[PDB]
Amino acid sequence: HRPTTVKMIDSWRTEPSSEKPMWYNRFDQVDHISQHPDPEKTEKYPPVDDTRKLMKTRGDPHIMRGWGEYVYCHYEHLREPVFPRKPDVAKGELAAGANVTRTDVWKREGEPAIQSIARFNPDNFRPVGYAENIPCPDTCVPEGHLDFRHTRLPTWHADRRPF
Amino acid sequence: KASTLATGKGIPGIDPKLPTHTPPASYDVLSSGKARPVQVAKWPPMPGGVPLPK
Amino acid sequence: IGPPLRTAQIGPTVGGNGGRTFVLYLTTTINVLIAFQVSWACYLQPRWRSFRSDMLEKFPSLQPDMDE
Amino acid sequence: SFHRAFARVVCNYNKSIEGSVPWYQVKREKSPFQQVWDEVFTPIWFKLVKGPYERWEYNALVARYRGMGIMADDAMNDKDMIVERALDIIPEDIRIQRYRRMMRGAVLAGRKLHLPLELQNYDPMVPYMAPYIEEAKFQMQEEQELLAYHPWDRRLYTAGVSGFGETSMHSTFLTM
Amino acid sequence: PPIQKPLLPSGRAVLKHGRSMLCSGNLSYDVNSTIKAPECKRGMGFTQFKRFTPVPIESGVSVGNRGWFFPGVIPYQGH
Amino acid sequence: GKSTIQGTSYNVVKFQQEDVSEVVKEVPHFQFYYIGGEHKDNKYRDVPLDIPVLTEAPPPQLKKPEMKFSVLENGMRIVSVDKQGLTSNLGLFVHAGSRFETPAEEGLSHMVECVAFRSTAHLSHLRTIKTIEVLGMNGGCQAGREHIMYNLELLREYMPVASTLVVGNVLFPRLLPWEVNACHKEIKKAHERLKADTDQYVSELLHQTAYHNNTLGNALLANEGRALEHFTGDNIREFMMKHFSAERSVFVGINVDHDELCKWLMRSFAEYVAIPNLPRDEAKPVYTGGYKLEENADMPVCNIAIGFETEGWNSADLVPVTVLQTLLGGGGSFSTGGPGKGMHSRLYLNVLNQNPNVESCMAFNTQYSDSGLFGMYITGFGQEAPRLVDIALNELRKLDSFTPDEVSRAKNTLKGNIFMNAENSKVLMEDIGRQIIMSGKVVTPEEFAARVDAVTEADLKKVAAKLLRKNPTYVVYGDTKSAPHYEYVRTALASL
């Protein structure tokens, strides 16, 4: 990789993601990745006819504060603590990265430990409502947009090379 | 309510099982097992977050 | 045949960017020192002189006339 | 020698702060002064400036994503190294739909068009990349702590690399 | 004091597959032993330079691929 | 002894709940970072090494080493010896080798070895390997036909850490998809490492030919074609659930305090659930014999091996057949052995001294829980193969009688080999772990010596007769263009 840098630092004013997630921290956990619902075969939210009927959005406009230019984003580069805050996976909070390894949120009472940690593969967590919201495009030219089919000249047209 | 995608199922704040916001819940013990330290301030916060020497 | 298998890159995958950190520190330093000079000469200094000059109404030991 | 003394000062000051709880894991009660400030200024400021301004920006951002037909996490640039390290490990199903959405968005943006409203009723702020961003950050932090804790010395401008740290050949001007 | 082992520890099993401490012969001089004291055909001392790794050297075999290339693909200007 | 397991009595170590705060106090001290320091000039900078500098040394405390046996409540057996050395050898043996693979599970035992010391529930892959390194520890994992071993050699002071790391490979391994995919490289390396050792490669050919597509025959290494389809974390986990269990595992420790090792191992399993023990299909090996002629275009030499089935480690023929191996002994022209190095073995005197065209002739005796292979291994130039086989067959026909002098020399040499091999700590660790896995019991070197002394010529004749009645296994490797056919070998041995 080229000369590069990431702001992976311990901030004095901003908390790490493990302490204050900026995303909507509700996820659905499965035992195996195959058990997730299929987005392509899942019915989506009903279409609307007015822009003022389009559904509401889970993001929090005011997730970030202080002086500075406005931004909405889910992620940061800040370093995580040696002993991260235990995620509340029972209520749907995400457990990934440092908050799984350096915490015991994965332990079940009687399950074999190998089986318990397997459920916390990052692939077994997906955001709630993923299959019902993610756009699955079938083309880059949506219906009603111009393409070569409409712009093609009639087959009786004269040669356009000479001009 | 919020029994179908049309009725608002899965829309935070409109679905009874989804909150409007998801703040992290408070904890009284650190994950290490140490008791969470508690500090009470009587002066406004430092201007840049600048820590003071031990 | 089939999609490529997922694998993490052996790292570290960052580094080698010290010239950019130098520019940051040089630029901040210069502009932090420009702030001090402009804040002093254009605002503080003028007001300080006025105070001292109105603190000479007391004239216990104001500057002497000759003392060349 | 004055360097040897400074080395003892640094060693002793760091030994005295081992195991300290980070500032964000300390239960903190705001100062009375801050409490008064947060009951007079914060309420009014939110009702008149912050609230309206940040809703104005947020709603516009949602509309822009809906017009492009993309999610918020699609907008991340892979020139960021955390994003790249996360994109290495995303599953193929997520990867396929992510590419198609980004391709459609660029086509529409380039041709100055917008997604048909029939396809715009979705939540663009679903954080589908979150699990893999967190894993990538964990991997990078381990490498940082276990393999990059010192400014290492290497033979300079050899093997196509400057020796100052970068790992790709011919990735600087002086390394052409 | 003298160093009697190579700076690179083997890290492999001493006894061979299916062979035990009873049926491995004498590990001090047996030909198949992985810890047989080497032969002083030309004198003592060359073991400080000897490569005790059994697998013959494959000149130029790559070990610096961080996952950026597939096998058989030649990098061009490191990209 | 509170519990008897498979013929051996163990002292039961009880699981106790202790606070992390209190156990932390007992973890060995080490630093990864050194941020400053207290300068101190080398006080011995001007002292030559011939001048002693240490005074008032505590008097030594020597104890005769004894092997102690304990078992945790989860069923994990712990066997340790302390020879009072300064470097320890901790090993974890699991009774899950290639022999327990089904044909659809080909290579999975090797795959488990490849993913060893990767990410666990409480430690990343990088952090596990950087810790093992900074503490100056060496080791790895090796998958065999009957067992898989995870070993670490360490300074005894750091055993609390090493025990944890080894056990984490079998307790809570995170078989993350992208970490497993990075281990596909090791398959090709393993094949090259095997084929480089010609003797071990010819041994792999013997077992595959001897036992046709069954337990011991099962290839030891995974192939890099169709086997990669199931070289996945999910597949590995299913294999581990079937075979890896605390009841089938045995933690051996050499040069470690038993009570300390048991304590730290107890703490490692106390708050976690090990893989439950489930019944599995355990079929006896089927010996078919046969022949395989593998060509190596680059080799001009011919390696010939003729083998026969042995009942195995758990039989009463084990010690007598090992005396037979020492009696026949063998050697190689490459080596120049001094007195007492097999110069007067039957093979050396009858084959090497009388046949200048023979490059090497040796006897081999592999031993597994319920089966084994015994035979001769002879090498030479390719065109000499017809004569090499004749020499080997002639020696096999001389096993009908043995002179008293030969028997005594074989018994004395075998006892010397046993005692001299035992003093190596890594050898002792592997011997103990492989013994318990195979038999559930440990036979000490002295006890084996007692058995060796009781072997008579009648026992040697009886064992040899049984071996020669089995269908031979006939392997030729290298330049095979002149070797006889398998039926020639069979007809020669049909008389026996």
Ligand SMILES: CCCCCCCCCCCCCCCCCC(=O)OC[C@H](COP(=O)([O-])OCC(O)COP(=O)([O-])OC[C@@H](COC(=O)CCCCCCCCCCCCCCCCC)OC(=O)CCCCCCCCCCCCCCCCC)OC(=O)CCCCCCCCCCCCCCCCC
């Ligand atoms: C008409 C209006 C006029 C207004 C004038 C005044 C306007 C001032 C605006 C800026 C300051 C606002 C108030 C600041 C309160 C204290 C903040 C604090 O402690 O921050 C720590 C705090 C660290 O928290 P963090 O979240 O962990 O930071 C993460 C970052 O990514 C950090 O990333 P990293 O981890 O890679 O770290 C990079 C490193 C980079 O740091 C460096 O490069 C270090 C070296 C340069 C800075 C420090 C030395 C400067 C020279 C001092 C004098 C030396 C005299 C020597 C005499 C020798 C005699 C023998 O920086 C840090 O670690 C944090 C410090 C950031 C640099 C600034 C530190 C000084 C703050 C005060 C600035 C000057 C105020 C003048 C006021 C005049 C009267 C009104 O920093 C921040 O809150 C973020 C940065 C905010 C400041 C950005 C400044 C940009 C550069 C230009 C500054 C001057 C602009 C105005 C110039 C106008 C005329 C030219």
